[PDB]
Homo-oligomer: A and B are copies of this chain.
Amino acid sequence: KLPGDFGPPRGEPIHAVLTSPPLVPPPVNRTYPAKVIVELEVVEKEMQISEGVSYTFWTFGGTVPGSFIRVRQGDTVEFHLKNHPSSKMAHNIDLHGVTGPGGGAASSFTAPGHESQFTFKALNEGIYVYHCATAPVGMHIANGMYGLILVEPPEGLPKVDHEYYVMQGDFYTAGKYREKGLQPFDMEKAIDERPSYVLFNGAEGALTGDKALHAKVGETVRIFVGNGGPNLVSSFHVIGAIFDQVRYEGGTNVQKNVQTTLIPAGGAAVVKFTARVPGSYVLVDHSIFRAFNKGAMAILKIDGAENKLVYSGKELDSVYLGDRAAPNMSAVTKATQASVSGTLTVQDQVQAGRALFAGTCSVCHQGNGAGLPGVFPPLAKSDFLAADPKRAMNIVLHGLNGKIKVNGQEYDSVMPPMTQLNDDEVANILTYVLNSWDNPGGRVSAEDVKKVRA
């Protein structure tokens, strides 16, 4: 009568091995139901949500999303939740897929330095979100308290070459996007569902550049995709590919051959991809400003031979991926820390500005600052730049239009304002430009930009 009716646990008790994102535990590879002991510890800690931007995350297992749990339908799971002594808050857990009130919540309340346990049978196959369930629930979830549990079918999932773990969340900082420093949680933005960041795996760039997911032409890739929310619904999409299969939770329905699929807040799906041609495939929330303005992009990078019969074109670059085309933006972290320490050098600024110039400025002005004849004026050896570095701050913040002369040529176009750039970002970008391409050197400070903005 109950699903998952495979008899009492047999064999030996199994201690679950949990993995950190973006990795997944191995398939259970088991033909009998077991007692599975799961131990998960809550840790509150600061981490970088973006370069030079710290946030106090609340985590299951030290990561956002939390550690991945993998069991078999019909297993009896003895769930142990610990809360690290350093925690200020109590925490608990609601696992979707659990049959019982709160998905475990009332029997997993755990004060700092304590441990709780409860037992459940995994009656329901599927991929499922788990999350904290402690008042105020939204604050806990917003601070990163979510992950995935996979309950396998008894026969296991079909074999694939790679399995990965990707989870979207919306985040609410007091400061604006890319404003540096330790950013508090912002309850007002959270209630209004107005996130400052929308991320995969807890940070900007968590899955881009040198942190990309990998596979090779011809391989299959399964991705366990969660949406921790707390509030957003993801228009989840793969740029330049298709999903062979998309299956939500433990649903009977499987959709095949779709590129764009809606993942509810608190939802999860298993997607399958087959690599056909090399290059970078971007996982996004196709509510586009999330993907391109708030951090909601991840990369699956495929290595192998080009097939000109299928696609003649080139790998992605900064025109599309912006400043996440490059391996990383570590120079930005280093410049921000140098500013805090009072040791910020011109070169710290130049290297940070170099990272930030990609896409943001280079789409028009080019990576070498040459511009494009008749269309975009040069930043390289620019007389107009050199003539008035203050004017340049105004141009970045407030745009520029009308006829101008640069290096003896007339331009009569429109540079849109870029007011969303933070003071340090404008300063560092301009300091990069001034110290490149035979420009006159010197520097622009965040304080200089603050004054022009005001």
Q: Which residues of A contact B (CB under 8 A)?
A: 2, 76, 88-90, 92, 94, 96-109, 111-113, 118-121, 123-126, 128-129, 133-139, 141, 187, 190-194, 229-233, 235-237, 239-242, 248-253, 255-262, 264-268, 276-277, 279-282, 286-294, 308-320, 322, 359-360, 363-364, 372, 374-375, 413-414, 416-417, 419-420
Question: Are B233 and A287 in touch, CB under 8 angstroms?
Answer: yes
| A99/B276 contact (C-beta < 8 A), A257-B126, A264-B261, A316-B105 known | yes
For A268, what are the chain B residues with a Cβ–Cβ distance below 8 Å? 260
- Determine the residue in chain B with the shortest Cβ distance to A194: B192
For A250, what are the chain B residues with a Cβ–Cβ distance below 8 Å? 242, 257-258
* Interchain CA distance A3-B133 in the complex, whole Å: 45
For A193, what are the chain B residues with a Cβ–Cβ distance below 8 Å? 287, 289
- Determine the residue in chain B with the shortest Cβ distance to A419: B187
* Interchain CA distance A229-B125 in the complex, whole Å: 32
For A89, what are the chain B residues with a Cβ–Cβ distance below 8 Å? 364
* Interchain CA distance A318-B102 in the complex, whole Å: 11
Question: Are B266 and A286 in touch, CB under 8 angstroms?
Answer: yes
Question: Are A230 and B287 in touch, CB under 8 angstroms?
Answer: yes
Question: Are A319 and B106 in touch, CB under 8 angstroms?
Answer: yes
Shortest C-beta distance, A80 to chain B (Å), equals 13
For A267, what are the chain B residues with a Cβ–Cβ distance below 8 Å? 235, 260, 286
Q: Which residue of B194, B233, B312, B314 contacts A119 across the interface (Cβ within 8 Å)?
A: B312
18 A-B pairs, CB-CB below 8 angstroms? A88-B375, A92-B320, A99-B276, A101-B239, A106-B314, A108-B313, A109-B319, A111-B372, A121-B311, A124-B259, A133-B319, A187-B420, A193-B287, A233-B262, A242-B250, A248-B255, A249-B259, A251-B256
